[PDB]
Design a protein around this ligand. Structure first.
Ligand SMILES: O=c1ccc2ccccc2o1
Length: 121
């Protein structure tokens, strides 16, 4: 759920999901359309696509458990949906950590109309 995901984000990046990643670019927070604005926005695009592969699951509210072995995020086994949502989130968190050096504040509260172009998953 958005509860575990936000906790991963904070531990990885040191930033708070809201509002650091809830209104960033074209895909972080609104789901959305357009061409990802940067690496971090690409993390969100892929994350959205990951959730998109789980039609019969509920990522926002289904809670899962995860632990950290040597700092590494480890998804604990739960239901099938829980295992897969965790992996989707785990990947986004790492992706965010990997692109921290490039995170830009000019993309916060990005206006919707500036999100143009297309990109399928
Ligand atoms: O798209 C979202 C995702 C999570 C969330 C949590 C609190 C308030 C607003 C939110 O919007």
């Amino acid at each position: 759920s958005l509860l575990e995901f936000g906790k991963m984000i904070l531990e990885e990046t040191g930033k708070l999901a809201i509002p650091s990643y809830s209104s960033y670019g074209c895909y972080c927070g609104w789901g959305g359309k357009g061409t990802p604005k940067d690496a971090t926005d690409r993390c969100c695009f892929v994350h959205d696509c990951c959730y998109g592969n789980l039609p019969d699951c509920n990522p926002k509210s289904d809670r899962y458990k995860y632990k950290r072995v040597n700092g590494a995020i480890v998804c604990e086994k739960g239901t099938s949906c829980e295992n897969r949502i965790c992996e989707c989130d785990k990947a986004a968190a790492i992706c965010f950590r990997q692109n921290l050096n490039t995170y830009s504040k000019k993309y916060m509260l990005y206006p919707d109309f500036l999100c143009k172009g297309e990109l399928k998953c």
